[PDB]
RNA sequence: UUAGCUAGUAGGUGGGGUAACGGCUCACCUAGGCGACGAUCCCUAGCUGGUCUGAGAGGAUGACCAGCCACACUGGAACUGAGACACGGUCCAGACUCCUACGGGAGGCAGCAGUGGGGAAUAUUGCACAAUGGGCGCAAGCCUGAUGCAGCCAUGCCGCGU
RNA sequence: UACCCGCAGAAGAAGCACCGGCUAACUCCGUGCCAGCAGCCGCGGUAAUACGGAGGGUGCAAGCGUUAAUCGGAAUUACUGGGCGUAAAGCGCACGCAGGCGGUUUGUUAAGUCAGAUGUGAAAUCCCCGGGCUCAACCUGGGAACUGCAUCUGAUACUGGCAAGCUUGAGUCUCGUAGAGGGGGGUAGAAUUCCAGGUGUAGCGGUGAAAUGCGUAGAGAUCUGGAGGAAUACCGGUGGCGAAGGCGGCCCCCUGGACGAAGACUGACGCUCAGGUGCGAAAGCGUGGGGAGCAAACAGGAUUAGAUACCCUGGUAGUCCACGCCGUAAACGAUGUCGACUUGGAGGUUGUGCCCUUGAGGCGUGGCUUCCGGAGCUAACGCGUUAAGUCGACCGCCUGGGGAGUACGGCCGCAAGGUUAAAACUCAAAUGAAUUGACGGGGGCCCGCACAAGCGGUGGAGCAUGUGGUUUAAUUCGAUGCAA
RNA sequence: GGAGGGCGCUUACCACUUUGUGAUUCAUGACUGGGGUGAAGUCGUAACAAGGUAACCGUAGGGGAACCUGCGGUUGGAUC
């Protein structure tokens, strides 16, 4: 635009929309799951992911992701949901921590023990 | 109340007047607009009823080409002589003279593979209905030779909607000398399933009534107070291709069939059509 | 993707009110006022001295220290007083929490601790008026969850040790 | 309690992330598109430096990862500091108010601008110079800064206001020329078809085969004549005219724009723009006419286990005309307008002069239009004295590809719809230009029985247990175009 | 005794209400639309690389499905 076209209409910047629909100025969010089922990831991949729906407390039903070689969750239990970015699962944009609250973690693990709540064995 | 009530015929005549969409009975369309009054925006009533004429309920628009059917009837009935050495010899000639007329579209044609084995295997569970009805009689009105091969002689009256096809097949009463103990009349069943009969032949019903609404099939059988029926569907699964996209005319039955007076009697799956036998208390 | 808004709203005189200038509050007279240099309305947000990012121009933010304004269960209104339409004053209406011999009354942690609930998350029902500051008193003295400290969590910065 | 002193005693005190390319830093095993990480590109089918585990190394440390918010990165919101031919980007094209902006000479004023001084911009913090808790963090003195605003006192290059002038941009007018510029009447010819005579009768129209239509109540074809309607062949070249759209017969009236040319007068009445107004092909609509052809729906005949795609035979709207509404295109020159600067040559059209127009041309001075090309500009193709080059004034649109030029809310309509103009979700792209090559229901170039031809064969419903059909007294077995 | 004060009495504005009547707004929603992605139709073919193939723009009529026809427009153009 020319200099005269800037004193009437300012530069309207973007809304800075993040990759998450809502966050309530909160990094993590606690929810409760309803049903446990498995879906199909994408056309190239060929794996079975834990695509489970977890209903939050603000009235939003967003589907997260549960990673691990086997979790032991119950239909009526609290589930903490954090942030994450996954492309192989369309419609999914959240993860799920383990080893905290009513969710257990994996055992007999040494490398990458800072996540999934794994504990240090006494060697 | 012209906003909604003088704005039903402005919509309805237009379909039933145009020679391209005129393949319908006035009552059939009188119904399908009071149903769809509150369905699409008040400036888009006739406009999106054309969606039910193309995306849905189509090919019946333009119709089945009766001016191609008689073109293959007058070119058919005047091919071989009429060996009618007696009165049932007018039927055996009328048998093949009729057979090919149900074989232009590949639907009642996949039915002509069942003219000797599955037109009597159905009488062992309903009797021999002398009060009979039929839904979707597009090209299935010459089943009488085989229906009466067993001894069905009661009123068989199939109801189609394409009038350019019903009148290209109703003239046959005397032109083809079809039996004189049978009537036919127009009518739909996504709109009009009211009456009482004994056998309810459902040939081209398929899931076109379950296309008018999501999961609304168990309604019609009951509306026509009844006893039994016969309901078939295509099974043209191409070596594991049409699986799922063609195996639903069933799983919507057994599942939904717990709770009311409806039950099931028998079930088969041969040729290209899987017939259903139904019961009520 | 809110286009006109406004009849005590604009202006003169007189009267009246306030510690003071004023349609703040009236009568009369007049037909003007504001507005694409963005009037009104809706939504949202405290502002400033700063901090954070960046070499700057900018953008974002308004926590702690500090200036100023507004609020004191939810509304409205008034008195005492030099300064307030009053946070631990009072009267009254409504809601909620209690007591009572059914005539009925009292009270406010958006103060420091602490409890229940919501939330991925933030403390001990502590010590002392020694210093500082404020109110009262001639002085002494007393009051002062403001301040000065301790305890708790590695939240951050910095240093040291294993 | 800080600090200080003494005794015993290496005793109680180091984890975590990463370990494909970004981005420094690897071996094997288990598992085999199965079980699993995750920021991007992605990895995972008996050899994983991308999973898990062991070992090793690196980053870093009382902290290492992940997640959330802002900024830098991001020139991915460009006043500092980018584009608009083809990538997502100039409105179909103009006249113009409120705005922005406006040459030359002189003078005044001193708003803007510039300089000096005063007042003020509270403390911490940021900044600079030092000191003090053992040091640092923290804290602190002094100085500077707070880019701002206001008053007083000056200068007068530019800008702005007022007054007074000039001409280099040129308005207008006199004297001329060129044009389908636009509109209202009238006139002529050819052709199709209809309506009337004479003459001539089983064929005519039409599709590679067939048929429908049209004919013995005078068809088709031909001559003459008449009625009605529409379009202007050769002349006709990317020529001319207009802002764009658009408009080609001679031709009357009314009337506009542009350009040439020797001389006067008036002295920037100048450029551009939101809203608004006006124009805007074709198609479509409302109120009235015309209606011979052609031609969207509709229907006769073909055709095929379905052509409302194409072929053939007819026709209602529409095309034409008077009066209105809607304002939609590849409305493209994918290029807004105006002004100024800038190596040149070669083809048309249209004015005014010189020269021997005696060789119907050279040599000068303008408008419009086409092509090539250097410097320069741009990714590339190209543009390249009509700018998309080099400067300046004004405005509009576009901030990834789909959803979507949509829905909703206003405006514009008797309708069909248009204009202004989103939020979610999905995806790691999308789109452009130049290459290298495959390929094409391959032709201009091209070599060979490349198909033949000229002395002659193989090809035998027998068989040579090598053998092109039935075979388990075939199968304990090979190899399937002297290109497997 | 008066002045005047105070209580009562009463008029003014005025919160809480209360009956009708609109605007904006808000949360679910009874009746729902189309998109959307998972899916998935051994379709070039009703025209078997011969039953002899431009792409698009605006608009109208036919839109079982991308289309196809009328009118005008453009180059941004299968064998050619
Ligand atoms: Mg006054
Ligand atoms: Mg920067
Ligand atoms: Mg800095
Ligand atoms: Mg800054
Ligand atoms: Mg606070
Ligand atoms: Mg007082
Ligand atoms: Mg209190
Ligand atoms: Mg409270
Ligand atoms: Mg809780
Ligand atoms: Mg003191
Ligand atoms: Mg403390
Ligand atoms: Mg890892
Ligand atoms: Mg990696
Ligand atoms: Mg590993
Ligand atoms: Mg930036
Ligand atoms: Mg090109
Ligand atoms: Mg426009
Ligand atoms: Mg102007
Ligand atoms: Mg000045
Ligand atoms: Mg100054
Ligand atoms: Mg020091
Ligand atoms: Mg300092
Ligand atoms: Mg200082
Ligand atoms: Mg001076
Ligand atoms: Mg000016
Ligand atoms: Mg001046
Ligand atoms: Mg002047
Ligand atoms: Mg003319
Ligand atoms: Mg004649
Ligand atoms: Mg004759
Ligand atoms: Mg003639
Ligand atoms: Mg005529
Ligand atoms: Mg002179
Ligand atoms: Mg003069
Ligand atoms: Mg202009
Ligand atoms: Mg037209
Ligand atoms: Mg028009
Ligand atoms: Mg018309
Ligand atoms: Mg054009
Ligand atoms: Mg354009
Ligand atoms: Mg021109
Ligand atoms: Mg060139
Ligand atoms: Mg360019
Ligand atoms: Mg986008
Ligand atoms: Mg997007
Ligand atoms: Mg050679
Ligand atoms: Mg073998
Ligand atoms: Mg394009």
TrEMBL record, chain B:
Its UniProt entry gives the catalysed reaction(s) as: guanosine(1405) in 16S rRNA + S-adenosyl-L-methionine = N(7)-methylguanosine(1405) in 16S rRNA + S-adenosyl-L-homocysteine
Annotated positions binding S-adenosyl-L-methionine: 105-111, 136, 160, 188-189, 212
This protein is called what?
16S rRNA (guanine(1405)-N(7))-methyltransferase
* Major enzyme class: transferase
Q: Keyword Transferase, does the record have it?
A: yes
Its annotated function is as follows:
Specifically methylates the N7 position of guanine 1405 in 16S rRNA. Confers resistance to various aminoglycosides.
| Presence of keyword Transcription regulation | no
Q: What is its EC number?
A: 2.1.1.179
Gene Ontology BP annotations: response to antibiotic
What keyword terms does UniProt attach to this protein? Antibiotic resistance, Methyltransferase, Plasmid, rRNA processing, S-adenosyl-L-methionine, Transferase
Stored SUPFAM superfamilies: S-adenosyl-L-methionine-dependent methyltransferases
What does the similarity note say? Belongs to the methyltransferase superfamily. Aminoglycoside resistance family.
Q: Identify the NCBIfam families for this entry.
A: 16S_rRNA_Rmt_C, 16S_rRNA_Rmt_gen
Task: Identify one Pfam family in the record.
Answer: FmrO
Identify a single GO molecular function assigned to this protein.
Answer: rRNA methyltransferase activity
Q: Which organism is it from?
A: Escherichia coli
